[PDB]
Write a structure and sequence with these properties.
By secondary structure, this protein is of the alpha+beta class. The chain has a single domain, classed as P-30 Protein (Roll), CATH 3.10.130. 18% of the residues lie in helices and 33% in strands. It contains three helices and seven strands. The strands form two sheets. The protein has a four-stranded antiparallel beta sheet with strand order 2-3-6-7. The protein has a three-stranded antiparallel beta sheet with strand order 1-4-5, covered by helices on one side. The longest helix has 9 residues. It is found in: Secreted. Its EC number is 4.6.1.18. GO terms for molecular function: lyase activity; nucleic acid binding; ribonuclease A activity; RNA nuclease activity. One of its GO terms (biological process) is defense response to Gram-positive bacterium.
Length: 124
Amino acid sequence: KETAAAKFERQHMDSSTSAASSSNYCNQMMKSRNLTKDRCKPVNTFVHESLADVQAVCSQKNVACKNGQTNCYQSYSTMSITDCRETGSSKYPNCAYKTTQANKHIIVACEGNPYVPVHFDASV
């Protein structure tokens, strides 16, 4: 079955674009990445960087995860990201999101060997 590292790439990476180009970006990407298959996921962030730069965060600033775990890392640099949050008209299966583009540091949780990101914690 899908690994946790492959699932983080499917849910959070979009190296093919530099930034969201229109208000429809979240609607199209949440659907195409299959995140609205069983239900509408309420929030999700896409990161518009190369996978090598996001995997490198695992060896950057170790910080506590919002749930208290200590295998989280904060990127030293800000990154281009897109926040997708479910709107008031969202109704399964036609899930609807608001697209917000921003430049922030990201926080991920890492595991394994190679040690790579497997959960997107927060952006700050």
